[PDB]
Amino acid sequence: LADLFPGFGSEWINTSSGRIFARVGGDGPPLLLLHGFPQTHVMWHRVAPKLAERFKVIVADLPGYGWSDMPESDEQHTPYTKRAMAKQLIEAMEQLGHVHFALAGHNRGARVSYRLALDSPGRLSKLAVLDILPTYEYWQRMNRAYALKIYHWSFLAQPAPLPENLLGGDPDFYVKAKLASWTRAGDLSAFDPRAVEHYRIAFADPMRRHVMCEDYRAGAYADFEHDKIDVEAGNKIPVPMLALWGASGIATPLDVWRKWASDVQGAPIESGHFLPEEAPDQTAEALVRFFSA
Amino acid sequence: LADLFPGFGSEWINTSSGRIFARVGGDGPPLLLLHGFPQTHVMWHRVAPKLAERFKVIVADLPGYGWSDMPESDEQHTPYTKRAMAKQLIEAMEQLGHVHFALAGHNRGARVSYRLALDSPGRLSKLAVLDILPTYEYWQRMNRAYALKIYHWSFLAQPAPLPENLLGGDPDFYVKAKLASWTRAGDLSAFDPRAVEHYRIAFADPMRRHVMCEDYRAGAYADFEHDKIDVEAGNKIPVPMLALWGASPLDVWRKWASDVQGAPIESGHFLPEEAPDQTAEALVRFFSA
Ligand SMILES: [Ca+2]
Ligand SMILES: [Cl-]
Ligand SMILES: [Cl-]
Ligand SMILES: [Cl-]
Ligand SMILES: [Cl-]
């Protein structure tokens, strides 16, 4: 496996829930970056160097993904709820001495990030969420057209061991098909092949696949209920926020986020779902500008 | 593979789109019985005997399922649309001289049946559907709760080869998990083991699995659009109808049919195997007078 962050250090950070693996580089105000599914920290490799010119950049594997430890799950999928993931990432930031920091997330990592902002807002100076709406909004919109377009939320959420058994025959084919499908061109051309190999090796481990299904189970059940509480109570994030989305992505999104956040700006970018790999210069620039302003 | 139909013949019926396999027994008025997913005609083995006391009973494999031939599909999944399946079964019944008959179906076979009643109501004396609502109604109901409960409607409808590739690694597990999870018991104890082997053997074949996905792609697209036209026109099935459902709906069918009666049966989805006495008794009494 290639080193895609040349000159960045590496840290295995202890927490009460297990170790978090991270690459660490640059100098300046602290900025945590969080990937999602079906990827690892390496998806930030095209934008990290440029962010590292202006910030101390912490590129972490999510609890249970990549090289971070995989805690044993339970009947409510607790450790892979976004509430618990956020708590665990807060502890890992405190081990480095960061109690107030900037945060950007993508896909599941964006879900950890907004949940973090709702539960513990004093932790964040600013927040960016890339190509997502809140988990409550995804589910509230569900109808035949969305059910057919974005099927995997309900598939990976079926009780164990159904999705796990289906995915075990030919795991490479599933992970590569997902990566390609969500891009603008529908192929693997946007990704560095050494980044594709990181994703494929993680996806080849049955234990790593189980974590991803637990993540999506949490997505269908506890995460949804936690969001519902907040929207029914009218709670909005007060942290200044940016919503960036792909014109051809999965997530207008800015109008949805205005219901969830009192100080939000946003823009589309010409891209599929994978903004930091499909549109690196534009994504790096939008983030540097937002976090420096 | 076991003969589960004592005193029934075995027939291959020709049609313009391929052969339909059927077990045929009994005498008297004609009654066609249609299975669904993930099963074959064998799923009527416990109720067909009682029905054959009074009727001439035709127990057919759906187009592409079991031992029926598999017509070539196309980009709109045409031969696995319920409209096309019904036209093909209408042709099969004509090869036997049956142009007006009674019809009961379960799961996919019930969708063929109600679409047959909507398209060609003159073909049917009476109609029974087991544990379904119309395809349009399931889709209209597709919120978070339904997306989770009935996930396979969206998964099996994903463009080829995604579900076919996944089902290929351990098909025995997938079929047995479906059978089990929709029963009251949650295991395979309601089923005869010989019937389970018919279902496993059919599901073990990649070409039979592809047909199943074509059926669900039809269910997501043309079949939905067909139902939508009837709902927008206010069309109602005129044929006398019975809706049976597992306690583990009559109001829904009253919107789709002008002469409908209905009852729950103590059962999961697989009424003719979980609740064979009660299912047979209800069908016999409906179809008699
Ligand atoms: Ca320490
Ligand atoms: Cl979303
Ligand atoms: Cl770019
Ligand atoms: Cl069905
Ligand atoms: Cl019974």
Coordinates of C-alpha atoms and ligand atoms in Angstrom, one line a residue:
Chain A
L1 CA 0.0 0.0 0.0
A2 CA 1.3 3.5 -1.1
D3 CA 2.0 6.5 1.1
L4 CA -0.2 9.2 -0.4
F5 CA 0.7 12.0 2.1
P6 CA 4.4 12.5 1.7
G7 CA 6.0 14.2 4.7
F8 CA 2.9 13.7 6.9
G9 CA 3.4 11.8 10.2
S10 CA 1.3 8.9 11.4
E11 CA -0.4 8.5 14.9
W12 CA -2.4 5.7 16.5
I13 CA -4.5 7.6 19.1
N14 CA -5.9 5.7 22.1
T15 CA -9.5 6.3 23.2
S16 CA -11.9 4.6 25.5
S17 CA -13.5 3.0 22.4
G18 CA -10.3 1.9 20.6
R19 CA -7.5 3.4 18.6
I20 CA -8.0 6.0 15.9
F21 CA -5.5 5.9 13.1
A22 CA -4.5 9.3 11.6
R23 CA -2.1 11.0 9.2
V24 CA -0.9 14.4 10.6
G25 CA 0.8 17.3 8.7
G26 CA 1.2 21.1 8.3
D27 CA 1.1 23.7 11.1
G28 CA -1.5 26.4 12.0
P29 CA -5.0 26.1 13.4
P30 CA -6.2 22.5 13.8
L31 CA -8.4 20.9 11.1
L32 CA -9.9 17.4 11.2
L33 CA -10.9 15.7 8.0
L34 CA -13.3 12.6 8.1
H35 CA -14.0 10.3 5.2
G36 CA -16.9 8.0 4.6
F37 CA -18.1 4.8 2.7
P38 CA -16.6 2.8 1.0
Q39 CA -13.3 4.7 1.6
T40 CA -10.6 5.5 4.2
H41 CA -8.6 8.6 5.2
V42 CA -6.7 8.4 1.9
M43 CA -9.6 10.0 -0.1
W44 CA -8.3 13.4 1.1
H45 CA -4.9 12.9 -0.5
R46 CA -5.4 15.3 -3.3
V47 CA -6.5 18.2 -1.0
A48 CA -4.5 17.6 2.2
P49 CA -1.2 19.0 0.9
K50 CA -2.8 22.3 0.0
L51 CA -4.8 22.5 3.3
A52 CA -1.5 21.7 5.1
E53 CA 0.0 25.0 3.8
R54 CA -2.4 26.9 6.1
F55 CA -3.6 24.4 8.9
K56 CA -2.4 21.6 11.1
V57 CA -4.3 18.8 9.3
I58 CA -5.5 15.6 11.0
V59 CA -6.7 13.0 8.5
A60 CA -8.4 10.2 10.5
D61 CA -9.9 6.8 9.8
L62 CA -13.5 6.7 11.3
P63 CA -14.1 4.2 14.2
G64 CA -14.0 0.7 12.6
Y65 CA -12.7 1.8 9.2
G66 CA -9.2 1.7 7.6
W67 CA -6.7 1.0 10.3
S68 CA -8.7 2.3 13.3
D69 CA -9.8 -0.4 15.8
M70 CA -13.1 -2.2 15.3
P71 CA -15.2 -2.1 18.6
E72 CA -17.6 -5.0 19.0
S73 CA -21.2 -3.8 18.1
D74 CA -24.5 -4.5 19.9
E75 CA -28.2 -4.8 19.3
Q76 CA -28.6 -1.0 18.8
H77 CA -25.4 -0.7 16.7
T78 CA -24.1 1.8 19.4
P79 CA -20.4 2.2 18.6
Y80 CA -21.2 2.9 14.9
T81 CA -23.9 5.5 15.6
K82 CA -22.7 9.0 14.6
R83 CA -23.3 10.1 18.3
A84 CA -20.8 7.6 19.5
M85 CA -18.3 8.1 16.7
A86 CA -18.4 11.8 17.4
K87 CA -17.7 11.2 21.1
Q88 CA -14.8 8.9 20.2
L89 CA -13.3 11.5 17.8
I90 CA -13.6 14.2 20.5
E91 CA -11.6 12.0 22.9
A92 CA -8.9 11.4 20.2
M93 CA -8.7 15.2 19.5
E94 CA -8.2 15.8 23.3
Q95 CA -5.2 13.3 23.3
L96 CA -3.6 15.7 20.8
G97 CA -4.5 18.8 22.8
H98 CA -7.3 19.9 20.5
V99 CA -10.5 20.9 22.4
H100 CA -11.7 23.5 19.8
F101 CA -11.1 22.8 16.2
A102 CA -12.3 23.1 12.6
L103 CA -13.9 20.1 10.9
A104 CA -14.7 18.8 7.4
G105 CA -16.5 15.6 6.6
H106 CA -17.7 13.6 3.6
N107 CA -20.5 11.0 3.3
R108 CA -20.5 9.0 6.7
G109 CA -17.8 11.4 8.0
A110 CA -20.1 14.4 7.3
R111 CA -22.8 12.7 9.3
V112 CA -20.4 12.3 12.3
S113 CA -19.6 16.0 11.8
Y114 CA -23.1 17.5 12.0
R115 CA -24.0 15.1 14.8
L116 CA -20.9 16.4 16.6
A117 CA -22.1 20.0 16.0
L118 CA -25.6 19.2 17.4
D119 CA -24.3 17.4 20.6
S120 CA -21.2 19.4 21.4
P121 CA -21.1 22.7 19.5
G122 CA -18.4 24.3 21.7
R123 CA -15.9 21.8 20.2
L124 CA -16.0 23.4 16.7
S125 CA -14.9 26.7 15.3
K126 CA -16.4 25.9 11.9
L127 CA -17.9 22.9 10.1
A128 CA -18.0 21.8 6.4
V129 CA -20.2 18.9 5.1
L130 CA -19.6 17.5 1.6
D131 CA -22.3 16.0 -0.6
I132 CA -24.8 15.1 2.1
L133 CA -28.1 16.0 3.6
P134 CA -29.1 15.1 7.2
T135 CA -30.0 11.4 7.7
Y136 CA -33.5 12.5 8.8
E137 CA -34.0 14.3 5.5
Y138 CA -32.8 11.3 3.4
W139 CA -35.4 9.1 5.1
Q140 CA -38.3 11.6 5.0
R141 CA -37.9 12.0 1.2
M142 CA -38.1 8.2 0.7
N143 CA -40.5 7.3 -2.1
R144 CA -40.3 4.9 -5.1
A145 CA -37.9 7.1 -7.1
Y146 CA -35.4 7.6 -4.2
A147 CA -35.8 3.9 -3.1
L148 CA -34.6 2.8 -6.6
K149 CA -31.9 5.5 -7.0
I150 CA -30.3 5.0 -3.6
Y151 CA -31.0 1.4 -2.6
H152 CA -28.0 0.6 -0.5
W153 CA -29.2 2.4 2.7
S154 CA -32.0 -0.1 3.0
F155 CA -30.0 -3.1 1.7
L156 CA -27.0 -2.7 4.1
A157 CA -29.4 -2.1 6.9
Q158 CA -31.0 -5.6 6.7
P159 CA -30.4 -7.8 9.8
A160 CA -27.0 -9.6 10.0
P161 CA -25.9 -11.8 8.3
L162 CA -27.9 -11.1 5.1
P163 CA -25.8 -8.2 3.5
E164 CA -22.5 -9.7 4.9
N165 CA -23.2 -13.1 3.2
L166 CA -24.1 -11.5 -0.1
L167 CA -21.0 -9.3 -0.1
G168 CA -18.5 -12.2 0.7
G169 CA -18.6 -13.9 -2.7
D170 CA -17.0 -11.2 -4.8
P171 CA -16.2 -8.2 -2.5
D172 CA -13.9 -6.4 -5.1
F173 CA -16.6 -6.2 -7.7
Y174 CA -19.1 -4.5 -5.3
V175 CA -16.7 -1.9 -3.9
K176 CA -15.4 -1.0 -7.4
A177 CA -18.9 -0.8 -8.8
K178 CA -20.0 1.6 -6.0
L179 CA -16.9 3.9 -6.5
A180 CA -17.5 4.1 -10.2
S181 CA -21.3 4.6 -10.1
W182 CA -21.2 7.6 -7.9
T183 CA -18.7 9.6 -10.0
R184 CA -19.7 12.1 -12.7
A185 CA -18.4 9.8 -15.6
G186 CA -19.6 6.5 -14.0
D187 CA -16.1 4.9 -14.2
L188 CA -12.9 4.8 -12.0
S189 CA -11.0 7.5 -14.0
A190 CA -11.3 10.1 -11.3
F191 CA -9.4 8.1 -8.6
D192 CA -5.7 7.5 -8.2
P193 CA -5.3 3.7 -8.7
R194 CA -3.2 3.5 -5.5
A195 CA -6.1 5.1 -3.6
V196 CA -8.5 2.5 -5.2
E197 CA -6.2 -0.2 -3.8
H198 CA -6.5 1.2 -0.2
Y199 CA -10.3 1.0 -0.5
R200 CA -10.3 -2.5 -2.1
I201 CA -7.9 -4.0 0.7
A202 CA -10.1 -2.5 3.5
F203 CA -13.3 -3.9 1.7
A204 CA -11.6 -7.4 1.4
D205 CA -11.7 -7.9 5.2
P206 CA -15.1 -9.5 6.4
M207 CA -14.7 -7.7 9.7
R208 CA -14.4 -4.3 8.0
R209 CA -17.4 -5.1 5.9
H210 CA -19.4 -5.9 9.0
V211 CA -18.6 -2.5 10.5
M212 CA -19.9 -0.8 7.3
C213 CA -23.2 -2.7 7.6
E214 CA -23.4 -1.7 11.3
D215 CA -22.8 1.9 10.2
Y216 CA -25.8 1.7 7.8
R217 CA -27.9 -0.1 10.5
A218 CA -27.3 2.8 12.8
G219 CA -28.1 5.0 9.8
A220 CA -31.6 3.4 9.6
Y221 CA -32.4 3.3 13.3
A222 CA -30.6 5.2 16.1
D223 CA -29.1 8.0 13.9
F224 CA -32.5 8.7 12.4
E225 CA -34.1 8.9 15.9
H226 CA -31.4 11.2 17.2
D227 CA -32.0 13.5 14.2
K228 CA -35.8 13.3 14.5
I229 CA -35.5 14.6 18.1
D230 CA -33.6 17.6 17.0
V231 CA -35.8 18.5 14.0
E232 CA -39.0 18.0 16.1
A233 CA -37.5 20.3 18.8
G234 CA -36.4 22.9 16.2
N235 CA -32.7 22.7 17.2
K236 CA -30.3 24.3 14.7
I237 CA -26.5 24.1 14.6
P238 CA -25.1 27.5 15.6
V239 CA -21.5 26.8 14.4
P240 CA -20.8 28.7 11.1
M241 CA -21.2 26.0 8.4
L242 CA -20.4 25.3 4.7
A243 CA -22.4 22.9 2.6
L244 CA -20.6 21.8 -0.6
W245 CA -22.3 19.4 -2.9
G246 CA -21.8 17.8 -6.4
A247 CA -24.0 18.9 -9.3
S248 CA -24.2 15.1 -10.1
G249 CA -23.9 13.8 -6.5
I250 CA -26.2 12.1 -4.0
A251 CA -27.4 15.1 -1.9
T252 CA -31.3 22.6 -3.2
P253 CA -29.1 21.3 -0.4
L254 CA -28.5 24.8 0.9
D255 CA -32.2 25.3 1.4
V256 CA -32.4 22.0 3.4
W257 CA -29.4 22.9 5.5
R258 CA -31.0 26.3 6.4
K259 CA -33.6 24.3 8.3
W260 CA -30.8 22.6 10.4
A261 CA -28.3 25.5 10.9
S262 CA -28.6 29.2 11.7
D263 CA -25.4 30.3 9.9
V264 CA -24.8 28.4 6.7
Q265 CA -23.4 29.1 3.2
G266 CA -22.9 26.7 0.3
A267 CA -22.2 26.0 -3.3
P268 CA -22.4 23.3 -5.9
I269 CA -19.3 22.0 -7.7
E270 CA -19.3 20.2 -11.1
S271 CA -18.7 16.7 -9.8
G272 CA -20.2 13.4 -8.7
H273 CA -20.2 12.4 -5.0
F274 CA -16.5 12.2 -4.5
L275 CA -15.7 15.9 -4.4
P276 CA -12.1 15.7 -3.0
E277 CA -10.9 13.3 -5.8
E278 CA -13.1 14.4 -8.7
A279 CA -12.7 18.2 -8.2
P280 CA -9.6 18.6 -5.9
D281 CA -8.5 22.1 -6.8
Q282 CA -12.0 23.5 -6.4
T283 CA -12.7 21.6 -3.2
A284 CA -9.4 22.6 -1.6
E285 CA -10.0 26.2 -2.5
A286 CA -13.5 26.3 -1.2
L287 CA -12.3 24.8 2.2
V288 CA -9.2 27.0 2.6
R289 CA -11.3 30.1 1.9
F290 CA -14.1 29.1 4.3
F291 CA -11.8 28.1 7.2
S292 CA -9.5 31.1 6.8
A293 CA -12.3 33.6 6.6
Chain B
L1 CA -36.8 -34.3 -6.5
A2 CA -40.1 -35.6 -5.0
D3 CA -43.5 -36.1 -6.6
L4 CA -45.7 -34.1 -4.2
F5 CA -48.9 -34.3 -6.3
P6 CA -50.5 -37.8 -6.0
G7 CA -52.7 -38.6 -9.0
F8 CA -51.9 -35.5 -11.1
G9 CA -50.4 -35.6 -14.5
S10 CA -47.4 -33.6 -15.8
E11 CA -47.8 -31.4 -19.0
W12 CA -45.7 -29.2 -21.1
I13 CA -48.0 -26.6 -22.7
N14 CA -46.9 -24.7 -25.9
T15 CA -47.3 -21.0 -26.4
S16 CA -45.9 -18.3 -28.8
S17 CA -43.4 -17.2 -26.0
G18 CA -42.3 -20.7 -24.8
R19 CA -43.6 -23.7 -22.9
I20 CA -45.4 -23.6 -19.5
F21 CA -44.9 -26.6 -17.2
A22 CA -47.9 -27.7 -15.1
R23 CA -49.2 -30.5 -12.8
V24 CA -52.9 -31.2 -13.8
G25 CA -55.4 -33.2 -11.8
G26 CA -59.1 -33.5 -10.9
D27 CA -62.3 -33.0 -12.9
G28 CA -65.0 -30.3 -13.1
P29 CA -64.7 -26.6 -13.6
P30 CA -61.1 -25.4 -14.5
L31 CA -59.0 -23.6 -11.8
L32 CA -55.5 -22.3 -12.5
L33 CA -53.1 -21.9 -9.5
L34 CA -50.1 -19.5 -9.7
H35 CA -47.0 -19.4 -7.4
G36 CA -44.6 -16.5 -6.8
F37 CA -41.1 -15.8 -5.5
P38 CA -38.9 -17.6 -4.6
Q39 CA -41.0 -20.7 -5.2
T40 CA -42.4 -22.9 -7.9
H41 CA -45.8 -24.7 -8.5
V42 CA -44.8 -27.1 -5.8
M43 CA -46.0 -24.5 -3.2
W44 CA -49.6 -25.6 -3.8
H45 CA -48.9 -29.3 -2.8
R46 CA -50.9 -29.2 0.4
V47 CA -54.0 -27.4 -1.0
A48 CA -54.3 -28.7 -4.6
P49 CA -55.6 -32.2 -3.4
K50 CA -58.5 -30.7 -1.6
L51 CA -59.2 -28.4 -4.6
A52 CA -59.0 -31.3 -7.0
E53 CA -61.9 -33.0 -5.1
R54 CA -64.1 -30.5 -6.9
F55 CA -62.2 -28.9 -9.8
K56 CA -59.9 -29.6 -12.6
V57 CA -56.7 -28.1 -11.1
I58 CA -53.8 -26.7 -13.3
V59 CA -50.7 -25.9 -11.2
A60 CA -48.4 -23.9 -13.4
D61 CA -44.9 -22.6 -13.3
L62 CA -44.8 -18.9 -14.2
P63 CA -43.0 -17.9 -17.4
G64 CA -39.3 -18.3 -16.7
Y65 CA -39.7 -20.0 -13.4
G66 CA -39.4 -23.7 -12.4
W67 CA -39.5 -25.9 -15.5
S68 CA -41.3 -23.3 -17.8
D69 CA -39.1 -22.0 -20.6
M70 CA -37.4 -18.6 -20.2
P71 CA -38.2 -16.2 -23.0
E72 CA -35.5 -13.7 -24.0
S73 CA -35.9 -10.4 -22.2
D74 CA -35.2 -6.9 -23.5
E75 CA -34.5 -3.4 -22.1
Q76 CA -38.1 -2.9 -20.8
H77 CA -38.2 -6.4 -19.2
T78 CA -41.3 -7.1 -21.4
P79 CA -41.7 -10.9 -21.1
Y80 CA -41.5 -10.6 -17.2
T81 CA -44.1 -7.9 -17.0
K82 CA -47.4 -9.1 -15.5
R83 CA -49.2 -8.0 -18.6
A84 CA -47.1 -10.2 -20.8
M85 CA -47.1 -13.1 -18.3
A86 CA -50.9 -13.0 -18.2
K87 CA -51.1 -13.0 -22.0
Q88 CA -48.8 -16.1 -22.1
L89 CA -50.9 -18.0 -19.5
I90 CA -54.1 -17.0 -21.4
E91 CA -52.5 -18.7 -24.5
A92 CA -51.5 -21.8 -22.4
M93 CA -55.1 -22.1 -21.1
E94 CA -56.4 -21.9 -24.7
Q95 CA -54.2 -24.9 -25.6
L96 CA -56.3 -26.9 -23.1
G97 CA -59.6 -25.4 -24.3
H98 CA -60.1 -23.2 -21.3
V99 CA -61.2 -19.7 -22.2
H100 CA -63.2 -18.9 -19.0
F101 CA -61.7 -20.2 -15.7
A102 CA -61.2 -19.6 -12.0
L103 CA -57.8 -18.2 -10.9
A104 CA -55.9 -18.1 -7.6
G105 CA -52.4 -16.6 -7.2
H106 CA -49.8 -15.9 -4.4
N107 CA -47.0 -13.3 -4.4
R108 CA -45.8 -12.6 -8.1
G109 CA -48.5 -15.0 -9.4
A110 CA -51.2 -12.9 -7.7
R111 CA -49.9 -9.9 -9.5
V112 CA -50.2 -11.8 -12.8
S113 CA -53.7 -12.7 -11.7
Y114 CA -55.0 -9.2 -10.9
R115 CA -53.4 -7.8 -14.1
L116 CA -55.1 -10.6 -16.0
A117 CA -58.5 -9.5 -14.5
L118 CA -57.8 -5.8 -15.3
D119 CA -56.8 -6.6 -19.0
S120 CA -59.1 -9.5 -20.0
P121 CA -61.8 -9.8 -17.4
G122 CA -63.9 -12.1 -19.7
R123 CA -61.4 -14.8 -19.1
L124 CA -62.3 -15.2 -15.4
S125 CA -65.3 -16.6 -13.5
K126 CA -63.7 -15.8 -10.1
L127 CA -60.4 -14.5 -8.8
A128 CA -58.5 -15.0 -5.5
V129 CA -55.3 -13.2 -4.5
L130 CA -53.2 -14.4 -1.5
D131 CA -51.2 -11.9 0.7
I132 CA -50.6 -9.0 -1.7
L133 CA -51.8 -5.5 -2.4
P134 CA -51.4 -4.0 -6.0
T135 CA -47.9 -3.1 -7.1
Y136 CA -49.0 0.6 -7.4
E137 CA -50.1 0.6 -3.7
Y138 CA -46.8 -0.9 -2.4
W139 CA -44.9 1.8 -4.2
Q140 CA -47.2 4.6 -3.1
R141 CA -46.5 3.3 0.5
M142 CA -42.7 3.4 0.0
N143 CA -41.6 5.4 3.1
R144 CA -38.6 4.6 5.4
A145 CA -40.6 1.7 7.2
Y146 CA -41.5 0.1 3.8
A147 CA -38.1 0.7 2.2
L148 CA -36.7 -1.4 5.1
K149 CA -39.4 -4.1 5.3
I150 CA -39.6 -4.7 1.6
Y151 CA -36.0 -3.8 0.6
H152 CA -35.8 -6.5 -2.1
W153 CA -38.2 -4.6 -4.4
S154 CA -35.4 -2.0 -4.8
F155 CA -32.4 -4.3 -4.5
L156 CA -33.6 -6.9 -7.1
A157 CA -34.6 -4.1 -9.4
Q158 CA -31.1 -2.5 -9.6
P159 CA -29.7 -2.6 -13.1
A160 CA -28.0 -5.9 -14.2
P161 CA -25.5 -7.3 -13.2
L162 CA -25.5 -5.9 -9.6
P163 CA -28.0 -8.3 -7.9
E164 CA -27.1 -11.2 -10.1
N165 CA -23.4 -10.9 -9.2
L166 CA -24.3 -10.8 -5.4
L167 CA -26.8 -13.7 -5.5
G168 CA -24.2 -15.9 -7.2
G169 CA -21.8 -16.4 -4.2
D170 CA -24.2 -18.3 -1.9
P171 CA -27.6 -18.7 -3.5
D172 CA -28.8 -21.5 -1.1
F173 CA -28.4 -19.2 1.9
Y174 CA -30.4 -16.3 0.2
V175 CA -33.4 -18.5 -0.8
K176 CA -33.6 -20.3 2.5
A177 CA -33.4 -16.9 4.4
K178 CA -36.2 -15.5 2.3
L179 CA -38.5 -18.5 2.9
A180 CA -37.8 -18.4 6.6
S181 CA -38.0 -14.7 7.3
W182 CA -41.5 -14.2 5.9
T183 CA -43.1 -17.1 7.9
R184 CA -44.7 -16.7 11.3
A185 CA -42.1 -19.1 12.8
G186 CA -39.0 -17.4 11.3
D187 CA -37.5 -20.7 10.3
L188 CA -38.2 -23.4 7.7
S189 CA -40.4 -25.6 10.0
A190 CA -43.7 -24.7 8.2
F191 CA -42.2 -26.1 4.9
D192 CA -42.0 -29.7 3.7
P193 CA -38.2 -30.4 3.2
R194 CA -38.9 -31.9 -0.3
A195 CA -40.6 -28.6 -1.3
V196 CA -37.6 -26.6 0.0
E197 CA -35.3 -28.7 -2.2
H198 CA -37.5 -27.9 -5.4
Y199 CA -37.1 -24.1 -4.4
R200 CA -33.3 -24.4 -3.7
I201 CA -32.6 -26.3 -7.0
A202 CA -34.4 -23.8 -9.1
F203 CA -32.7 -20.8 -7.3
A204 CA -29.2 -22.5 -7.8
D205 CA -29.4 -21.8 -11.5
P206 CA -28.0 -18.4 -12.6
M207 CA -30.4 -18.1 -15.5
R208 CA -33.4 -18.7 -13.2
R209 CA -32.1 -16.1 -10.8
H210 CA -31.8 -13.6 -13.7
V211 CA -35.4 -14.1 -14.6
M212 CA -36.4 -13.3 -11.0
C213 CA -34.5 -10.0 -11.1
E214 CA -36.2 -9.2 -14.5
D215 CA -39.5 -9.8 -12.8
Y216 CA -38.6 -7.3 -10.0
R217 CA -37.3 -4.8 -12.6
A218 CA -40.7 -5.0 -14.4
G219 CA -42.3 -4.6 -10.9
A220 CA -40.4 -1.3 -10.4
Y221 CA -41.1 0.1 -14.0
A222 CA -43.7 -1.2 -16.6
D223 CA -45.9 -3.0 -14.1
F224 CA -46.1 0.2 -12.0
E225 CA -46.9 2.4 -15.0
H226 CA -49.6 -0.2 -16.0
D227 CA -51.2 0.0 -12.6
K228 CA -51.0 3.8 -12.6
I229 CA -53.1 4.1 -15.8
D230 CA -55.9 2.0 -14.1
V231 CA -55.8 4.0 -10.9
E232 CA -55.9 7.4 -12.8
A233 CA -58.9 6.1 -14.9
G234 CA -60.8 4.7 -11.9
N235 CA -60.8 1.2 -13.4
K236 CA -62.1 -1.5 -11.0
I237 CA -62.0 -5.3 -11.5
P238 CA -65.5 -6.5 -12.2
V239 CA -64.8 -10.2 -11.6
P240 CA -66.0 -11.7 -8.2
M241 CA -62.9 -11.6 -6.0
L242 CA -61.4 -13.0 -2.8
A243 CA -58.5 -11.4 -0.9
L244 CA -56.8 -13.6 1.8
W245 CA -54.0 -12.2 3.9
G246 CA -51.8 -13.6 6.7
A247 CA -52.4 -12.1 10.2
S248 CA -48.6 -12.1 10.3
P249 CA -56.3 -4.8 2.9
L250 CA -59.9 -5.5 2.1
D251 CA -60.2 -1.7 2.2
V252 CA -57.4 -1.4 -0.4
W253 CA -58.9 -4.0 -2.7
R254 CA -62.4 -2.3 -2.5
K255 CA -60.7 0.6 -4.3
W256 CA -59.5 -1.7 -7.1
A257 CA -62.5 -4.2 -7.5
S258 CA -66.3 -3.8 -7.3
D259 CA -67.2 -7.2 -5.9
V260 CA -64.6 -8.2 -3.3
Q261 CA -64.8 -10.2 0.0
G262 CA -61.8 -11.0 2.3
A263 CA -60.5 -12.8 5.4
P264 CA -57.3 -13.0 7.5
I265 CA -55.7 -16.4 8.0
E266 CA -53.5 -17.3 10.9
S267 CA -50.2 -17.3 9.1
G268 CA -47.2 -15.5 7.8
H269 CA -46.8 -14.8 4.0
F270 CA -46.9 -18.4 2.8
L271 CA -50.5 -19.1 3.4
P272 CA -50.8 -22.4 1.4
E273 CA -47.9 -24.0 3.4
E274 CA -48.2 -22.4 6.9
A275 CA -52.0 -22.6 7.0
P276 CA -53.0 -25.2 4.5
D277 CA -56.4 -26.4 6.1
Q278 CA -57.7 -22.9 6.5
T279 CA -56.5 -21.7 3.1
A280 CA -57.9 -24.7 1.2
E281 CA -61.2 -24.4 3.1
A282 CA -61.6 -20.7 2.2
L283 CA -60.7 -21.2 -1.5
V284 CA -63.0 -24.3 -1.9
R285 CA -66.0 -22.4 -0.3
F286 CA -65.3 -19.2 -2.5
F287 CA -64.8 -21.1 -5.8
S288 CA -67.9 -23.4 -5.2
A289 CA -70.6 -20.7 -5.1
Ligands
CA1 CA -2.1 10.2 26.2
CL2 CL -27.7 12.5 1.7
CL3 CL -10.8 20.8 -9.5
CL4 CL -45.1 -10.1 -4.4
CL5 CL -54.6 -24.2 8.7

